[PDB]
Design a protein around this ligand. Structure first.
Ligand SMILES: Nc1ncnc2c1c(C#Cc1cccc3ccccc13)cn2[C@@H]1O[C@H](CSCC[C@H](N)C(=O)O)[C@@H](O)[C@H]1O
Length: 279
């Protein structure tokens, strides 16, 4: 891995500053855990996480969600979880009074009834629904996510966002405004990000040129940037994905006090890896 000296990783898609012509055990739960820890910890910093109800659609099996709840439960943050998925969740989520497990595929009608029974409490939406997928599959997925936003009207959302490939384009579509969070420990050449929105909802048109820009920017990220060693980075592992993970974890709150920030991130990574059974 070619060496590089960085002050900070790319945290959002907009920060990628070059492009290129496209050509771990249970790593997926780790990718979801960090992005959702990052998203929810940003909301905790804004003081809007407390008292909220996190509605997670497409949450199964959702092994990592147990670590998320235990983290905010041990911080004293009052959170209710509603995990909704047609598939059965990981049994490790059983027996938690603040975690409601719902075995159901959501449609427009069911989103209405969710909103009725949760209103007027604050809703935070996490969607990871997925139906290899075609462009029509993504367009239906992203349409369903817009429907989630228009109905549930969350105070904030994290949405699965991968642009359709330019060579499989069908039509222009619309997605919410927000910041497109980059995912460490994503698959080696995944172009998937998490759209993070805080609502104070204006839609954005997504064009075939944007698909080209996503494809080239994410390929440069996956081929060049993520295969670097950050030699100035004071950490036991200096591979970029660990550098990237480090900057996400420093936004995470802890009841325990540490002599240094590096000691905190090391503890958090140890805890996350140990729960996810990663060496
Ligand atoms: N509507 C839904 N409601 C609930 N869950 C759903 C869906 C859904 C759909 C869909 C349709 C989209 C558009 C149009 C349609 C028209 C007709 C029918 C369906 C759709 C997928 N899922 C679940 O997403 C998971 C993906 S991997 C997450 C992994 C997880 N994040 C983890 O932590 O492991 C997987 O378990 C699925 O069962």
């Amino acid at each position: 891995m070619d060496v590089v000296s960085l002050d900070k990783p790319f945290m959002y898609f907009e920060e990628i500053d070059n492009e290129l012509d496209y050509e771990l055990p249970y790593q997926g739960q780790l990718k979801l855990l960090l992005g959702e820890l990052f998203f929810l910890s940003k909301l905790q910093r804004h003081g809007i996480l407390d008292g909220a109800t996190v509605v997670y659609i497409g949450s199964a099996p959702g092994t990592h969600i147990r670590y998320l709840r235990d983290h905010f439960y041990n911080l004293g943050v009052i959170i209710k979880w509603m995990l909704i998925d047609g598939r059965h969740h990981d049994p490790i989520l059983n027996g938690l009074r603040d975690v409601t497990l719902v075995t159901r595929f959501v449609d427009e009608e069911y989103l209405r009834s969710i909103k009725k029974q949760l209103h007027p409490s604050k809703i935070i939406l996490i969607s990871d629904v997925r139906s290899e997928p075609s462009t029509a599959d993504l367009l239906s997925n992203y349409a369903l996510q817009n429907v989630m936003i228009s109905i549930l009207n969350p105070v904030a959302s994290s949405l699965k966002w991968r642009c359709p490939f330019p060579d499989q384009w069908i039509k222009d579509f619309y997605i919410p405004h927000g910041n497109k969070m980059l995912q460490p420990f994503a698959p080696s050449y995944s172009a998937e990000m998490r759209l993070l929105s805080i609502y104070t909802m204006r839609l954005t048109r997504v064009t075939k040129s944007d698909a080209v820009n996503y494809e080239k920017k994410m390929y440069y990220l996956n081929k060049i940037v993520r295969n670097k060693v950050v030699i100035n980075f004071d950490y036991p592992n200096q591979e970029y994905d660990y550098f990237h993970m480090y900057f996400m974890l420093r936004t995470v709150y802890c009841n325990k006090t540490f002599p240094t920030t590096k000691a905190k991130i090391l503890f958090l990574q140890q805890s996350i890896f140990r729960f996810l059974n990663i060496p």
